[model samples]
Target: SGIIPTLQNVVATVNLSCKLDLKNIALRARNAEYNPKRFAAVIMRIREPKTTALIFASGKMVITGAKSEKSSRMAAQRYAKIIHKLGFNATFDDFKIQNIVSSCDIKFSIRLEGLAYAHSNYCSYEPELFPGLIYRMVKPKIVLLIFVSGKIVLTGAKVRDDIYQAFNNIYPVLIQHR
Candidate 1:
């Protein structure tokens, strides 16, 4: 219970359900930009949540840098509001959290070599290339970057359950190397 994770960044996908009018949006929307030749989407930001999102003409949006699930949803709502006021039939529908990233410290160094050797199927460690061990967990389908300093950063989670459960499943193996 003590091995708690810090929610670093939460990514969510929101469908605006309207086609984009980039130039008009870029002109009218606050904290937004667009360049059809440079990019295919309108890049926008909000200060209340301090997050960024890529607004595509296809109505797909990828919101990034939200610290919590609620914040993620809230940011998307604000985005849809902007589009709504901009003369578009925009609705924030099907807002789904795509990924949750978190970091934690086990507080004890791990035996990286042994971990890689034993769990070769799921582990990939090349310290020269990268200082951390990449552990692909199949259950929750999370990828953990295990460092020798006991610091862990994990990705590929939708909700709190998957994030916590992934760490729960890996804690035992980490203990063996402690």
Candidate 2:
């Protein structure tokens, strides 16, 4: 076989829906596709504790207080650079960009299917049935949706960890306040 069939079993997917946090979002743009210095990622807003917000000029916005698609993209870029610098074949794929501002509560949901779900074991759960009788459940396909009400979700080893790991280099600047 040209490729392993099992390798096809796991596919990574990311779908983000959010509201733009304009105030600091403009501040964050200093690192985005900005002019003047033409620099990207002078912050750690992509890391944990700090969420991401993608705001447009027309006052339109999409934000994630826990994580932003930009942060994830930034992470992927760093990963690609590191791997390539090590003389390996690594590249970041184009992520789907979706802006759904018509919704309420400045929501941001990340749907992780295939690989990320598998690697994180997010598809596994257990149930308690009468004393010592316990049952395990597996959802091969899973989605992790997060809505930020101006704070971080403190769950043990959640999406935050993966996001933090992915935003290794740019995680510092994101800690700064506007």
Candidate 3:
């Protein structure tokens, strides 16, 4: 995908109480085939507040520089869908996508709670129930840049290759957002 020419639109902004089901988020990725190693792999668990992080089964992801409501909302939705097809049933509604999209000056934040950093010099993470771990496996294929004007520009992966399929699987739905 090509980057948008603009980067000053408002995507969404609101109090985010987003939670991606561990079981759901895990099943969404093809890489997660119920491996015993998963239980020992690094995960983004919930802990305190601030320090937002994305949780995944066997991958790592870091999203940054989201400055608009649309971009934020789109990121949440895109994330939900990416893991959905893997066996997870997470939906955009789970993250209150619309609420975030309706606000302004939103902040993208998450925390990796019970990651099993104790396993190997904090190199890996252990999954937790309440405060989860920061998903550090698959990188987000799609990038949505929203300007303060509510205009959105998306870029990145358009197919699945274990590393480049987050967008191709959900672009159809994202395009219809407008």
Best by lDDT: 1
- Per-residue error (Å), model 1, residue 20: 1.4
Per residue, candidate 1 scores C-alpha lDDT tens digits across 81-114 of 8888889898878989999999999788999999
Tens digits of per-residue lDDT, candidate 3, 1-178, equal 4322333222222222333445654454543333335453223222211112344443333322344434555554454445555444443332322211111122222222222232233223344432222222235534433332333334442222322243233333333432
Q: Report residue 17 deviation for candidate 1 (angstroms).
A: 1.0
> What does candidate 2's lDDT look like per residue over 1-178, in tens digits?
1111000011112222222233443353343433225432222234442444332333222334423445544543443343344343333443433321111122222222222333343323222322111111122111222222312221222233332332332112212211
List candidate 1 segments past 4 Å from native: none
Each model's TM-score?
A: 0.95, 0.22, 0.25
Query: Comparing 1 and 3 by lDDT, which wins?
Result: 1
Better by TM-score, candidate 3 or 2: 3
TM-score of model number 2: 0.22
TM-score of 3: 0.25
Of 2 and 3, the candidate ranking higher by lDDT: 3
Error of 3 at 84 (Å): 0.8
Superposed Cα RMSD, model 2: 19.8
RMSD of 1: 1.2
What lDDT would each prediction earn against the true structure?
0.90, 0.29, 0.34
93 in model 3: Cα distance from truth in Å?
2.1
